[PDB]
Design a protein around this ligand. Structure first.
Ligand SMILES: [Cl-]
Ligand SMILES: [Cl-]
Ligand SMILES: [Cl-]
Ligand SMILES: [Cl-]
Length: 337
């Protein structure tokens, strides 16, 4: 008998983002890494888990960068523009990500890497009216899984609407605005928000919104302890038809012959203290059943929610597990909202 009847006022404004749109200004944006040169495509194709060659001109693709054992080192959004490949690795990885690419940039490979991260400020949009907000600020047209250069400079990433376990997680757009145009774009967005009833999300409400959509993130759910298929992201981040790449054989073996021991799961719990990842225990025998990787409050669900990994024998919705202090968590369907 768990209390999932609560009022969690600190994240009540995700409701507006789910119905209209939410605006978020990250403190640390994803880096903006560009790859140029005659061998840029072959170079990146051999290290990304995604098929970069097949990708069209204004398309966006998700990829992992794996180690040789197929554990996740990074994720990135990947776009093409002119004779360049644009890569957006996770926030705070600009040096480590560039070093990882240079590890595979061998003698006489015709590719060059440039870090353009200080040229842009990131603004994020979420929710059903995201395209209408873009159409107001900018000209031409927009759709899911797209990568566009803005006429003024800068870029727009519109994520695919399907993400973990091919679930529809709604619209998400990332705007990389040239520094000198930032304060103007911000003023334009504040007017649009106030007039059209969207909401300015703070970091805790932005994270609650993403957790309500079941979205796994680097470094909590996506890191070198896990495989892309464990994370529910091999359908959007891995190609099983492409040629040689780092981690390909273990990725493929897991898929066709191996057995997935654990999988990304949603959790519901009652009502900052916990040290993540937290071990989850089976109440019957006290054995390890999974791990909880992050939590948020959800006013919509009236309880805490979280993401993590569940062993196969406990994956059914409604399965009850224990935290180390014996608070109960219940496996829940994704997305939560
Ligand atoms: Cl590696
Ligand atoms: Cl270089
Ligand atoms: Cl899409
Ligand atoms: Cl586990």
């Amino acid at each position: 008998n768990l209390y999932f009847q609560g009022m969690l006022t600190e994240v009540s404004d995700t409701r507006i983002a789910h119905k209209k749109f939410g605006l978020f200004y990250p403190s640390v944006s994803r880096p903006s890494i560009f790859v140029e040169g005659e061998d840029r495509k072959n170079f990146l194709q051999g290290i990304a888990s995604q098929d970069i060659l097949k990708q069209d001109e204004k398309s966006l693709s998700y990829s992992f960068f794996l180690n040789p054992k197929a554990r996740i080192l990074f994720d990135a959004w990947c776009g093409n523009f002119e004779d360049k490949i644009a890569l957006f690795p996770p926030a705070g990885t600009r040096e480590e990500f560039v070093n990882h690419l240079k590890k595979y940039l061998f003698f006489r490979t015709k590719a060059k890497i440039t870090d353009m991260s200080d040229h842009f400020r990131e603004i994020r949009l979420v929710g059903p009216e995201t395209i209408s907000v873009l159409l107001s600020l900018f000209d031409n047209n927009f759709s899911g899984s797209s990568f566009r250069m803005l006429k003024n400079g800068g870029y727009v990433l519109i994520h695919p609407t399907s993400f973990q376990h091919n679930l529809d997680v709604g619209l998400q757009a990332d705007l990389f605005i040239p520094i000198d145009q930032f304060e103007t774009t911000q003023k334009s967005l504040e007017d649009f928000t106030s007039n059209k009833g969207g909401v300015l999300l703070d970091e805790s409400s932005y994270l609650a919104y993403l957790t309500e959509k079941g979205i796994p993130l680097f470094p909590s759910e996506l890191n070198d302890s896990f495989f892309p298929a464990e994370a529910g992201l091999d359908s959007v981040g891995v190609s099983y038809n492409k040629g040689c790449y780092v981690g390909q054989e273990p990725v493929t073996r897991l898929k066709f012959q191996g057995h997935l021991n654990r999988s990304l799961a949603g959790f519901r719990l009652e009502g900052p203290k916990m040290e993540f990842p937290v071990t989850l225990f089976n109440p019957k025998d006290g054995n390890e059943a999974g791990i909880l990787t992050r939590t948020s409050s959800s006013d919509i669900l009236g309880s805490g929610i979280g993401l993590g990994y569940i062993k196969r024998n406990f994956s059914e919705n409604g399965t009850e597990l224990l935290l180390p202090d014996a608070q109960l968590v219940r496996v829940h369907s994704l997305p939560f909202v």
